[PDB]
Design an enzyme around this catalytic site. Structure first.
Site, mmCIF file in Angstrom:
data_model
loop_
_atom_site.group_PDB
_atom_site.id
_atom_site.type_symbol
_atom_site.label_atom_id
_atom_site.label_comp_id
_atom_site.label_asym_id
_atom_site.label_seq_id
_atom_site.Cartn_x
_atom_site.Cartn_y
_atom_site.Cartn_z
ATOM 1 N N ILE A 1 39.437 25.474 37.310
ATOM 2 C CA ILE A 1 38.132 26.015 36.907
ATOM 3 C C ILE A 1 38.361 27.191 35.939
ATOM 4 O O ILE A 1 37.777 27.226 34.855
ATOM 5 C CB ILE A 1 37.226 26.456 38.111
ATOM 6 N N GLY A 2 39.183 28.143 36.343
ATOM 7 C CA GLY A 2 39.432 29.310 35.530
ATOM 8 C C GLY A 2 40.860 29.773 35.563
ATOM 9 O O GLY A 2 41.618 29.397 36.429
ATOM 10 N N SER A 3 41.227 30.589 34.592
ATOM 11 C CA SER A 3 42.577 31.104 34.510
ATOM 12 C C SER A 3 42.577 32.602 34.293
ATOM 13 O O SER A 3 41.605 33.171 33.826
ATOM 14 C CB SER A 3 43.347 30.425 33.392
ATOM 15 N N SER B 1 47.431 36.601 35.721
ATOM 16 C CA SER B 1 48.172 36.433 36.962
ATOM 17 C C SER B 1 47.442 35.568 37.972
ATOM 18 O O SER B 1 47.892 35.428 39.094
ATOM 19 C CB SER B 1 48.444 37.790 37.586
ATOM 20 N N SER B 2 46.310 35.000 37.584
ATOM 21 C CA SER B 2 45.535 34.186 38.508
ATOM 22 C C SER B 2 44.957 32.907 37.936
ATOM 23 O O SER B 2 44.807 32.756 36.737
ATOM 24 C CB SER B 2 44.403 35.010 39.105
ATOM 25 N N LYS B 3 44.649 31.982 38.828
ATOM 26 C CA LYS B 3 44.057 30.720 38.465
ATOM 27 C C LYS B 3 43.099 30.292 39.557
ATOM 28 O O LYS B 3 43.328 30.564 40.714
ATOM 29 C CB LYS B 3 45.142 29.673 38.293
ATOM 30 N N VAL B 4 42.031 29.608 39.184
ATOM 31 C CA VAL B 4 41.069 29.119 40.146
ATOM 32 C C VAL B 4 41.031 27.621 39.993
ATOM 33 O O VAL B 4 40.958 27.113 38.902
ATOM 34 C CB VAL B 4 39.678 29.702 39.936
ATOM 35 N N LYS C 1 41.304 30.301 44.832
ATOM 36 C CA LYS C 1 41.767 31.268 43.875
ATOM 37 C C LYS C 1 43.204 31.567 44.219
ATOM 38 O O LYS C 1 43.529 31.951 45.325
ATOM 39 C CB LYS C 1 40.927 32.536 43.932
ATOM 40 N N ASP D 1 30.475 47.238 36.671
ATOM 41 C CA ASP D 1 30.801 46.370 35.555
ATOM 42 C C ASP D 1 30.015 45.085 35.589
ATOM 43 O O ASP D 1 30.537 44.049 35.238
ATOM 44 C CB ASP D 1 32.298 46.078 35.503
HETATM 45 C C1 LIG Z 1 32.202 28.023 37.378
HETATM 46 C C2 LIG Z 1 32.347 27.186 38.463
HETATM 47 C C3 LIG Z 1 32.872 27.666 39.649
HETATM 48 C C4 LIG Z 1 33.257 28.997 39.761
HETATM 49 C C5 LIG Z 1 33.763 29.535 41.055
HETATM 50 N N1 LIG Z 1 33.246 29.082 42.194
HETATM 51 N N2 LIG Z 1 33.834 29.791 43.195
HETATM 52 C C6 LIG Z 1 34.725 30.693 42.715
HETATM 53 C C7 LIG Z 1 35.536 31.627 43.342
HETATM 54 C C8 LIG Z 1 36.336 32.412 42.539
HETATM 55 N N3 LIG Z 1 36.383 32.315 41.204
HETATM 56 C C9 LIG Z 1 35.607 31.400 40.601
HETATM 57 C C10 LIG Z 1 35.811 31.302 39.170
HETATM 58 C C11 LIG Z 1 35.844 32.369 38.235
HETATM 59 C C12 LIG Z 1 36.111 31.841 37.040
HETATM 60 O O1 LIG Z 1 36.250 30.490 37.137
HETATM 61 C C13 LIG Z 1 36.059 30.187 38.453
HETATM 62 C C14 LIG Z 1 34.727 30.558 41.313
HETATM 63 C C15 LIG Z 1 33.112 29.830 38.657
HETATM 64 C C16 LIG Z 1 32.586 29.341 37.475
#
Ligand SMILES: c1ccc(-c2[nH]nc3ccnc(-c4ccoc4)c23)cc1
Length: 255
Positions: A17-19, A22-25, A39, A133
């Protein structure tokens, strides 16, 4: 095609989903086939200060789960000296991407989203946390309902669009979050943030802190929504409306 273990429970990786540096989701599936977001944080290059910031947010995230459903669920987690795995609720889209994709916004949807934002930010405040923020990226749409994704505690583009005058001057109280929230609502109302037109960052910061620089509030059929915006956007934090006051406002209370 890949798989991971968190607290002896196995998760199938669907996609990233995200990067982060130092982290990735990741979007994942559990044994019962339920969908979650995991995460992953790499702690190899993390200093002690960084570690305490990460631990502190996790503790606040876990504690505040009970208090509001407007805060993302943290189901389970695994933390070692090398990494952190957090099993969390999977959202549909962040509010930033959603607002960018959409042209017009429904008045009802806007009001609903505003209420959710107020409830999530109110909850952290009750626990002594001021995010400082806030941006649309900090909110997640799950089941047509907005949820706060983070608390601003852990070490972290750094846009100045939602930055309050007091944060620019200091280079910060609950009222700082009210300004940011107002900017978000303003975006949701007028399609741009109050100072979006000012391209140069230095010229922009000066405007935010300039009393003379008048923030435009064009006439709209929702007069209550116009008032909220003017109340949130007062430059002097002392003249700015509080979250508790925003909760009793006609815009969120009247049908
Ligand atoms: C779109 C879709 C899902 C999520 C997400 N759902 N639950 C999450 C938990 C922690 N971090 C994210 C994330 C942040 C950026 O990318 C993903 C999460 C965020 C954006």
């Amino acid at each position: 095609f890949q798989s991971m273990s968190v607290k002896g429970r196995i998760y199938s990786i669907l996609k990233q989903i995200g990067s982060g540096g130092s982290s990735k989701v990741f979007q994942v599936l559990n044994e019962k086939k339920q969908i979650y977001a995991i995460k992953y944080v790499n702690l190899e290059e993390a200093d002690n200060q960084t570690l305490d910031s990460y631990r502190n947010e996790i503790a606040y995230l876990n504690k505040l789960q009970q208090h509001s459903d407007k805060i993302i669920r943290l189901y389970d987690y695994e933390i070692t000296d090398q990494y952190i795995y957090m099993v969390m609720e999977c959202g549909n889209i962040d509010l930033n991407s959603w607002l960018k994709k959409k042209k017009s916004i429904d008045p009802w949807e806007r009001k609903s989203y505003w209420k959710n934002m107020l409830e999530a930010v109110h909850t952290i405040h009750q626990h002594g946390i001021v995010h400082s923020d806030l941006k649309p990226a900090n909110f997640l749409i799950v089941d047509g309902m907005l949820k706060l994704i983070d608390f601003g505690i852990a070490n972290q583009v750094g846009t100045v669009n939602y930055m309050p005058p007091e944060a620019i001057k200091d280079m910060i109280s609950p009222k700082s979050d009210v300004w940011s929230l107002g900017c978000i609502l303003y975006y949701m109302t007028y399609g741009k943030t109050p100072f979006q037109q000012i391209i140069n960052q230095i010229s922009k910061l000066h405007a935010i802190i300039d009393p003379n620089h008048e923030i435009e509030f064009p006439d709209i059929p929702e007069k209550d929504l116009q008032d909220v915006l003017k109340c949130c956007l007062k430059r002097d934090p002392k003249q700015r409306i509080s979250i508790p006051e925003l909760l009793a406002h006609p815009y969120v209370q009247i049908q």
